[PDB]
């Protein structure tokens, strides 16, 4: 039975791994920063209602230009809001309503969504003709699309419910890499600022960290007891905050190699839909499913604030990229600008 | 506003303008989630009506009915089956040819997939279009082959009636909730013809019972 | 994508006459279309506007109620109705797509035009220096003058230059001011502030002859510079 000895192999390298971040606690993050002034109360209002959407909001995504955010309903429609007049530039219909992710490229010219259909479709905004066309239709996911990141105009990292990531080349429509590993259903993805390598959590309780070139995964992050939904990267890309069906966001550090903080309140029982940074990383914003965001100071596990004013589960919620403002899309078809 | 601003506000109304004509041709659609085992016999039930999933669209009696298939997405149910919470009914499809055969039973499969979906908390007042495919061979695999072999404690005749009715009693006590949805059993196996008419039936019936809800008369 | 004007010819005046626009290639229903105009010998003037859905008409004060605009949104072609032609109507008439969202680029692309011979408050758009000699592989700036501040409350500046070239119809060059146009070479640059502004090439060629025409969009009197030629 070569089986007991290649399992037994397994567990003693768990064993050495687990030791080995014991041996690097030294000091919970908790101890370090209870000297650290905390943020008391921040008091975020909706400045912005995006009404528009007439089924779930499933995700949405901020422009690299902090303005314009494009988000996916069931509704089979993907509209990109100008989320300071809350005009809609654009109302994109998808072929398969059952979307499920969207993202906005960085450079603004493409969206991307994908859900049930098994397909990531590349949506042209900056057409010669006035309408958004699918430029690219991203098939060979056997599951859901659960997640897509572009990492520039020509290569997109998707997240699938096939438990495998997949990188592609949106020219070809070939998936120049694959990234398995994960055992359950991919739920998330985070790219890192420099993009050079990428999270991604799982309904397998474990985030593992993908560098997006050679395609292999550099680290495993196991510290949840529920199925990871929502993913996000600290801005210095040196760590990244989780969140899982079980009421919980815990902040794991890529260098660490080991969970630092968790952001969890016994008057949560809900689990996490979505999970964002503010730009400095202080807050740790996360939607929930008893339909409010709950801010969390990242460094005190404090929970800083509430945004309160979804009357359905928050799915989706992001910060801009100059951190103006926190986008929270939700189940009740409403998208809210909080600052 | 600027005078290029207020273009843009026009875009913007006229986008919400087609979004509303958009929404209210999608109300007027009566979705269907349409689940069973592959080959429970709900491609056959397609075929009548007529990867990711499949969406059918059936017009019939003045109604336009959307069929979603979601047997091809073999990942897992509990993160995708909230997208179908609005749905008008659930179409499962059963195979009543499969209570000997394995995948475990393949009838206990279809029972236990259906006792998920039908006591599945976004599904309680959902109600589920239960068909039973592949009567006729379920007719000739009964008349050889003992329904014991599926139901242990069956004790009943090995005729297509005695058993087609111990099957559907034993989906249909998996259905909890009895108040807020009922189980819409069918018997049809790949010439029945009317599967459509009693889909159409079934979900007028949720119709109007949900319209009866509505004023306190159910 | 392409505009190909209908009509035109020499009208007596007092007549009445309809220029069709036969737009093909691009989702015509989505974009508000204008009608330019331009005299033989002189610069560009706007006609008239028709916004996507047709809600929303605008027309030169020197020609409001005596023309009329129309799209055919099924058919993609846009229409100018125009009664009591008089001789000033005598004038290139450029049929002009614009579409107005976040980050659009307005009047990005502009029909051919229909020769029209008629027979025998507002924003000023100033271009004081006007045939400008240069050589080839040489900088060059074009100094736009603003009788309004065109930098909006909301920070765009909405300063348009376009490229007559000879035989040509223009050509979007930056749409609000520093906004390159697509397809334009990025040698075109737009800079300025308030009221003055100034377009500056960095090294031109043999394609960059022609005449460069301001144009104002913070109101709706569209008005254009007297274009500032450029010859070798």
């Known amino acids: 039975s070569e089986l007991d000895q290649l399992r037994q192999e397994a567990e003693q390298l768990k064993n050495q791994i687990r030791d080995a971040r014991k041996a690097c606690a030294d000091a919970t993050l908790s101890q370090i920063t209870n000297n650290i002034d905390p943020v008391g109360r921040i008091q975020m209002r909706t400045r912005r209602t995006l009404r528009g959407h007439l089924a779930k909001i499933y995700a949405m995504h901020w422009g690299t230009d902090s303005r314009l955010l494009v988000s996916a309903s069931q509704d089979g429609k993907l509209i990109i809001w100008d989320s300071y007049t809350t005009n809609k530039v654009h109302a994109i219909p998808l072929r398969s309503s059952w979307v499920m992710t969207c993202a906005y490229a960085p450079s603004g010219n493409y969206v991307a969504c994908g859900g049930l259909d098994n397909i990531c479709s590349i949506y042209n905004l900056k057409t010669r003709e006035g309408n958004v066309r699918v430029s690219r239709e991203l098939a060979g996911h056997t599951g859901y699309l659960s997640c897509c990141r572009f990492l520039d105009d020509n290569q997109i990292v998707t997240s699938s419910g096939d438990t495998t990531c997949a990188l592609w080349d949106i020219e070809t429509g070939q998936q120049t890499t694959t990234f398995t590993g994960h055992t359950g259903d991919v739920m998330s993805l985070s790219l890192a600022p420099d993009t050079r390598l990428f999270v991604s959590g799982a309904c397998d309780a474990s985030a593992k960290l993908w560098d997006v070139r050679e395609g292999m995964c550099r680290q495993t992050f196991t510290g949840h007891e529920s199925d990871i939904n929502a993913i996000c990267f600290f801005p210095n890309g040196n760590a990244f905050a989780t969140g899982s069906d079980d009421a919980t966001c815990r902040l794991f550090d890529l260098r660490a190699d080991q969970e630092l903080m968790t952001y969890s309140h016994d008057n949560i029982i809900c689990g996490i839909t979505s999970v964002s940074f503010s730009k400095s990383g202080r807050l740790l914003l996360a939607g929930y499913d008893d339909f409010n965001c709950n801010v969390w100071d990242a460094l005190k596990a404090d929970r800083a604030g509430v945004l309160a004013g979804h009357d359905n589960r928050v799915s989706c919620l992001g910060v801009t990229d100059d951190g103006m403002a926190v986008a929270t899309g939700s189940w009740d078809s409403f998208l809210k600008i909080w600052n | 506003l600027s005078a290029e601003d207020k273009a843009a506000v026009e875009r913007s109304k006229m986008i919400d303008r087609n979004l509303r004509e958009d929404g209210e041709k999608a109300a007027k659609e009566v979705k269907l989630l349409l689940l069973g085992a592959g080959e429970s016999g709900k491609n056959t039930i397609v075929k009548q009506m007529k990867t990711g999933i499949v969406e059918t669209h059936f017009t019939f009696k003045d109604l336009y009915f959307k069929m979603f298939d979601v047997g091809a997405q073999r990942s897992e149910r509990k993160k995708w089956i909230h997208c179908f919470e609005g749905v008008t009914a659930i179409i499962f499809c059963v195979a009543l040819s499969d209570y000997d055969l394995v995948l475990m039973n393949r009838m206990h499969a279809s029972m236990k997939l259906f006792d998920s979906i039908c006591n599945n908390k976004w599904f309680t007042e959902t109600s589920i279009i239960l068909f039973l495919n592949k009567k006729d061979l379920f007719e000739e695999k009964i008349k050889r082959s003992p329904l014991t072999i599926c139901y242990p404690e069956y004790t009943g005749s090995n005729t297509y009636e005695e058993a087609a009715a111990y099957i559907q009693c034993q989906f249909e006590d998996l259905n909890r909730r009895k108040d807020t949805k009922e189980i819409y059993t069918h018997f049809t196996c790949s010439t029945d013809t009317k599967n459509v008419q009693f889909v159409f039936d079934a979900v007028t019936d949720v119709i109007i019972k949900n319209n009866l809800k509505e004023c306190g008369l159910y | 994508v392409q505009l190909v004007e209908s009509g035109g010819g020499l009208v007596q005046p007092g007549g009445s006459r309809k220029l069709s626009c036969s737009a093909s290639?691009?989702?015509?229903?989505?974009?508000?279309m204008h009608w330019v105009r331009q005299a033989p010998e002189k610069g560009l003037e706007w006609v008239a506007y028709?916004?996507?859905?047709?809600?929303?008409?605008y027309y030169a004060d020197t020609v409001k109620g005596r023309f009329t605009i129309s799209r055919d949104d099924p058919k993609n072609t846009l229409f100018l109705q125009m009664t009591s032609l008089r001789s000033e109507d005598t004038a290139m008439y450029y049929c002009?797509?614009?579409?107005?969202?976040?980050?659009?680029?307005?009047?990005?692309?502009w029909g051919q035009g229909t020769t029209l011979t008629v027979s025998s408050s507002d924003i000023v758009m100033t271009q004081a220096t006007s045939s400008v000699p240069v050589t080839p592989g040489e900088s060059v700036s074009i100094s736009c003058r603003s009788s309004?501040?065109?930098?909006?409350?909301?920070?765009?500046?909405?300063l348009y230059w376009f490229l007559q070239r000879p035989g040509q119809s223009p050509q979007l060059l930056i749409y609000?001011?520093?906004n390159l146009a697509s397809g334009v070479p990025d040698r075109f640059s737009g800079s300025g502030s308030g009221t003055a502004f100034t377009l500056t090439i960095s090294r031109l060629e043999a394609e960059d002859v022609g005449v460069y025409y301001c144009?104002?969009?913070?109101?709706?009197?569209?008005?254009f510079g007297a274009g500032t030629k450029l010859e070798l």
């Open positions: 609000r001011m520093s």
């Open positions: 144009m104002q969009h913070l109101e709706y009197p569209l008005t």
């Open positions: 002009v797509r614009s579409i107005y969202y976040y980050g659009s680029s307005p009047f990005d692309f």
């Open positions: 028709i916004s996507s859905g047709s809600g929303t008409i």
């Open positions: 290639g691009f989702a015509f229903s989505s974009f508000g």
């Open positions: 309004k501040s065109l930098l909006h409350s909301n920070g765009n500046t909405y």
